[PDB]
């Protein structure tokens, strides 16, 4: 159904045949990034749910694969599996918790 990631197709008639217009999605402008498989935070290894860890040079973000939009590494978009001494290539970064600011505000 055409070269690339297929979105649509439209038929047209022709003498003794058919013609398909395949509408596809092509990635265009790429750039290099530094990546890691997991984040070792607080003795726990964090893996992305639907995405990949990238670095712009100083900080670490999680992003989708086919498009570049970054967001903060969070407990909501990651999951925990074991401790950080088995995975090869772990890096150290903090993981934000959205519960804790509203949790401490309720506590005080």
């Amino acid at each position: 159904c055409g070269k690339g990631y297929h979105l649509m197709s439209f038929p047209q008639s022709a003498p003794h045949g058919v013609v398909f217009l395949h509408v596809t999605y092509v990635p265009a402008q790429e750039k290099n990034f530094t990546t890691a498989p997991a984040i070792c935070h607080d003795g726990k290894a964090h893996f992305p749910r639907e995405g990949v860890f990238v670095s712009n040079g100083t900080h670490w973000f999680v992003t989708q694969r086919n498009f570049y939009e970054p967001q903060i590494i969070t407990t909501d978009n990651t999951f925990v599996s074991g401790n950080c001494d088995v995975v090869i290539g772990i890096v150290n970064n903090t993981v934000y918790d959205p519960l804790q600011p509203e949790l401490d505000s309720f506590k005080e």
Partner: protein
Amino acid sequence: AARDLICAQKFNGLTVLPPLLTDEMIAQYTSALLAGTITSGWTFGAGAALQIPFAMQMAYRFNGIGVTQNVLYENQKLIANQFNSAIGKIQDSLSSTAS
């Protein structure tokens, strides 16, 4: 020596034409496909080749099956050794059996 069969075919008007692509060109195409699918994953078949480490590509391919990616990263030496044994058995199967 003696009269070959191919010489008799040539003398009787039967000719074999060579193919357009040599075996070196087929080998170059195969090597290009292997290098692309090793270094870039499936991205070279949908546009520009985007590099990715092989363990992360294999974790993507495990998420394509139904297994979460924590299985590969905690067992990477086992999948590596199993793949090495499986590809080493192909040479031993091809060096003996001609069927």
